[PDB]
Design a binder for this molecule. Sequence first.
Ligand SMILES: NC(=O)c1ccc[n+]([C@@H]2O[C@H](COP(=O)([O-])OP(=O)(O)OC[C@H]3O[C@@H](n4cnc5c(N)ncnc54)[C@H](OP(=O)(O)O)[C@@H]3O)[C@@H](O)[C@H]2O)c1
Ligand SMILES: Nc1nc(=O)c2nc(CNc3ccc(C(=O)N[C@@H](CCC(=O)O)C(=O)O)cc3)cnc2[nH]1
Length: 159
Amino acid sequence: MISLIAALAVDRVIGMENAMPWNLPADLAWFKRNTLNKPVIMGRHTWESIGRPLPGRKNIILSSQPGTDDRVTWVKSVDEAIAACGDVPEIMVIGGGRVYEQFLPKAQKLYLTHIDAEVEGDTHFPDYEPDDWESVFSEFHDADAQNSHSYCFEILERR
Ligand SMILES: NC(=O)c1ccc[n+]([C@@H]2O[C@H](COP(=O)([O-])OP(=O)(O)OC[C@H]3O[C@@H](n4cnc5c(N)ncnc54)[C@H](OP(=O)(O)O)[C@@H]3O)[C@@H](O)[C@H]2O)c1
Ligand SMILES: Nc1nc(=O)c2nc(CNc3ccc(C(=O)N[C@@H](CCC(=O)O)C(=O)O)cc3)cnc2[nH]1
């Protein structure tokens, strides 16, 4: 059972050259509770962004090259990454764009934050056919004193 979890700006932008131009601590909170105690699969670039392992969690990093941090598990392929998670209720793929694209056809659930922010970036969430996905949960939030933009948490499940 694979789930992707991503924060998407307009045009499904999930990343760019620099830090995203926003401050969304509610989305961080959402990511933390939806990934808590689950194995997480990420690309090397996302591994690098995070700086250290997500705590209380198998962290699984895809790299074509051998690993460089023994605190986490390093794998050379999508299927190795899944196998490295073991036999768990739910594997979270936390990105980035190349990893999302490879895992989406395998996934049964998406956790997306849709952020009402206009950014240009080089990396985007894959197109998810909405005939393949049913939205089971949707929860919209205005920007506030803590959150720079409005955003909406959504969970979709594969049909
Ligand atoms: N021309 C471009 O614009 C271009 C192309 C690619 C990446 N990037 C840049 O890199 C940044 C982030 O990209 P992203 O979020 O896509 O990164 P990401 O998924 O977090 O990390 C991608 C890295 O993860 C590893 N990886 C992913 N799938 C794999 C597989 N099936 N088998 C083995 N290794 C795998 C590779 O690591 P290794 O590199 O260690 O093998 C790959 O380079 C962006 O700023 C992006 O523009 C740019
Ligand atoms: N909804 C969602 N929001 C995100 O911010 C997000 N980020 C990634 C990948 N990038 C990152 C970058 C940093 C951290 C991170 O360090 N989070 C810590 C909290 C510490 C902090 O950043 O303040 C965590 O335990 O989640 C996680 C994922 C993948 N899917 C997402 N999905």
